[PDB]
């Protein structure tokens, strides 16, 4: 018996994976081309994607790159209340 359910979003950012290598980007150069890779979601390069930051410019040359696979990362907390009788 679920009584109350609330869903909350902690973070919302975009992470880019290479189709071939399967790694995540961690760093880029002056031209925004990749300098490094990392196989860790927590350390990967991130573009903020909360509502105020949509339609960015900093990573246009990155997004257009076909080898890269953008991924929308979302972190959530949900609260579930229960009643179990006597």
């Amino acid at each position: 018996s679920i009584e109350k359910k609330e869903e909350v979003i902690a973070h919302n950012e975009v992470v880019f994976r290479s189709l071939t290598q399967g790694l995540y980007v961690k760093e880029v150069d002056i031209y925004s081309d990749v300098v490094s890779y990392t196989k860790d979601v927590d350390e990967a390069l991130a573009m903020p994607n909360t509502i105020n930051f949509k339609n960015s410019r900093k990573y246009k040359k990155l997004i257009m790159n076909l080898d890269l696979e953008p991924l929308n990362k979302i972190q959530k907390v949900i609260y579930e209340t229960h009643l179990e009788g006597l």
């Binding site: 880029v28 150069d29 002056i30 031209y31 925004s32 903020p48 909360t50 930051f53 960015s56 900093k58």
Partner: protein, 275 residues
């Protein structure tokens, strides 16, 4: 050696500031306290090698325009004398010595010795990293190189080390005359957006801390005392105001001069009274 504090600030700030803004991990540590919105917006703007916007730094009363989006502004400030010494004497030296340097070198294989070579004459050695040369090593200096004996050190033909040394100029021994000066210098960040200013000031505080470990700071510019003013509108006659929080930096340093001695006694003759 009169010390231009204003020049020293610019020399230290310009390289170090660029390095800090270059990476994102350090900025997050710096801006750990700030809220998410301000933190990322600043990072989106200036942080990273691919940042379109950039920060600038310069002195006051320039005849051109500065990047009022984000800029560091410096002005010399007051100065005072605090402590003297007897005869205004500070130190005595047997060798004309310049700045103190840190250099990296690799050991070279000579016959009896292993030697490091440095860009300039060694003069006075201070330290080689994590080596306590024993008397049997017979550590000695020669020109621009430092030498220690080979035996029971044979694993270290490829030793890679850092060296701290002084620039030697002349053998002319002389005295130092001078006193201590307590100087204050002003620094302020400028923007037409207050949030940027607060982030900018916080970045400054960190590199000031890092400067406490610098060679020049440890040896020449000591006893930091920081003081922050209130955020104020620097300008009001425009389409929008300019906001900046001034900071005051205090230093203790010596205004020194070299006095050379030529009266070197070498001969000494004893003659008894005729009576």
């Amino acid at each position: 050696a009169i010390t231009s504090v204003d020049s020293y600030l610019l020399s230290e700030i310009k390289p170090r500031l660029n390095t800090v803004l270059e990476n994102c991990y350090i900025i997050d540590e710096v801006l750990k306290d700030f809220d998410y919105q301000t933190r990322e917006s600043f990072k989106e703007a200036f942080c990273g090698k691919n940042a379109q916007h950039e920060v600038t730094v310069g002195f006051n009363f320039p005849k051109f325009k500065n990047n009022y989006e984000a800029h560091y502004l410096i002005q010399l400030g007051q100065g005072q004398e605090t402590k003297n010494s007897l005869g205004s004497i500070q130190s005595s030296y047997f060798e004309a010595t310049g700045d103190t340097l840190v250099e990296s070198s690799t050991a070279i294989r000579e016959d009896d010795k292993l030697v490091f070579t440095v860009s300039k004459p060694i003069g006075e050695l201070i330290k080689v990293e994590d080596i306590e040369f024993a008397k049997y090593d017979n550590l000695q200096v020669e020109g621009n190189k430092v030498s220690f004996k080979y035996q029971t050190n044979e694993d270290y033909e490829n030793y890679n080390a850092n060296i701290i040394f002084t620039e030697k100029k002349n053998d002319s021994k002389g005295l130092v005359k001078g006193f201590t000066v307590e100087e204050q210098v002003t620094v302020v960040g400028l923007s037409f957006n207050v949030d940027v200013a607060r982030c900018l000031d916080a970045v400054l505080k960190m590199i000031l801390i890092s400067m406490r470990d610098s060679i020049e700071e440890q040896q020449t510019f000591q006893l930091q005392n920081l003081s922050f003013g209130d955020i104020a509108p620097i300008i009001e006659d425009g389409d929008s105001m300019i906001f900046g929080r001034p900071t005051i930096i205090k230093y203790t340093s010596s205004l020194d001069l070299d006095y050379t001695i030529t009266q070197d006694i070498n001969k000494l003759t004893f003659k008894e009274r005729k009576d």
